[PDB]
């Protein structure tokens, strides 16, 4: 049935957005602990820029969820139902036991429109999104810049490493390569002056 097809697509999206908020807030929790344990003026300014990015991932993902759930609920059951945790209804709809479907399909197409502007689904994934943002790069370079000589490259290494040990405590080959990739994309700006 066409409703059982869209119900499966709606539930897959709802489960994916729920995991987005879980990953992002888990990053925020380790960052706020990492910010409180250490007393440095510099690295704390990085956590400020990073926290502002991670919290806004959560606000965006919850905004998409609360908009999609009533939309999915109306389609699955045409009879008036606009409540949260519709997970049970579409799940059983997806298995067993048109206007609103059109309404739903568009919102799913609308949702993916913002698929590019979506932080990770895991803690490693959100971390990668954090370092890719200009806001974090702009904050990081301002801290390492010196008025006279060239910006300090060794400090930029140390600050990014401390941030990466705030979010992902256990280092991996991927975390190391991710740290190197982000620092490399900044090489043009750490040679100015």
């Amino acid at each position, epitope marked *: 049935k066409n409703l059982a097809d869209v119900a499966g697509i709606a539930l897959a999206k709802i489960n994916n957005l729920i995991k987005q908020v879980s990953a992002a807030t888990e990053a925020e929790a380790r960052m706020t602990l990492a910010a409180a344990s250490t007393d440095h003026s510099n690295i704390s300014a990085l956590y400020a820029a990073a926290s502002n990015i991670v919290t806004r991932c959560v606000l965006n993902a919850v905004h998409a969820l609360t908009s999609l759930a009533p939309i999915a609920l109306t389609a699955a059951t045409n009879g008036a139902k606009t409540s949260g945790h519709i997970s049970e209804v579409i799940d059983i709809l997806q298995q067993a036991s048109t206007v609103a479907i059109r309404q739903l399909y568009n919102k799913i197409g609308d949702l993916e429109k913002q698929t590019t502007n979506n932080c990770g689904t895991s803690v490693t994934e959100v971390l990668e999104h954090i370092l890719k943002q200009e806001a974090l790069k702009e904050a990081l370079l301002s801290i390492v810049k010196k008025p006279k000589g060239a910006p300090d490259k060794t400090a930029a290494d140390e600050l990014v490493t401390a941030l990466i040990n705030g979010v992902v405590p256990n280092s991996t080959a991927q975390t190391q390569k991710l740290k190197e990739k982000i620092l*490399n994309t900044l090489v043009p700006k750490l040679v100015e002056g």
Partner: antibody
Amino acid sequence: EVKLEESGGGLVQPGGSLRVSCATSGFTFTDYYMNWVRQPPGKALEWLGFIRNKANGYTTEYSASVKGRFTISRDDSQSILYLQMNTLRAEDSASYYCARDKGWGYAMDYWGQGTSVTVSS
Amino acid sequence: DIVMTQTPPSLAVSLGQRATISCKASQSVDYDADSFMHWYQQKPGQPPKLLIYAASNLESGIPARFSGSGSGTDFTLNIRPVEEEDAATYYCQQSNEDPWTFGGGTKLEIKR
């Protein structure tokens, strides 16, 4: 200013081993990633690998043509870079260049003159 | 496992004119808008010299006659105006995915 020289090249028998070295001066060796690159006579440049600095764990990356046979190491006390070659084959004959990395496994901004290795019986 | 294809393999340009060398990647060597493509010059018997890093950044000490552009899979190196000292082979290199790879090289001949 920045100076890297290569040394240790020579004639090697097939299957034999050879260690080439790179003495550097004019910059803080410890702060930089270092690469090895080779060029067979009349052929294109070929990246062999790099070694990370002290801050990033002294670990290495290698191309597959050389993985398992060659080992890159460094001596931060003397600001010298090494490449240890084992189980050499005839097509490993090339000029071997030591090159300083501009970033963290990025582009190579300073190169040595190179040292020549010939593998032949 | 990124393959680098340079075109043309050989190029002859008159003094004062423009030389354009192109590198085509088998897959993207970019990371969002940031490029991991670099250009080197090698005169015969000499070590390579880095000209351009990250597609378009001119390395310090290199004259403004060199410039680079491109994104994703297609990049070009530009020499304007060409001089006698430009007689050399030029290589692209990508550091986007391990292992780093080089192009096959382009030999530039200066007409006289």
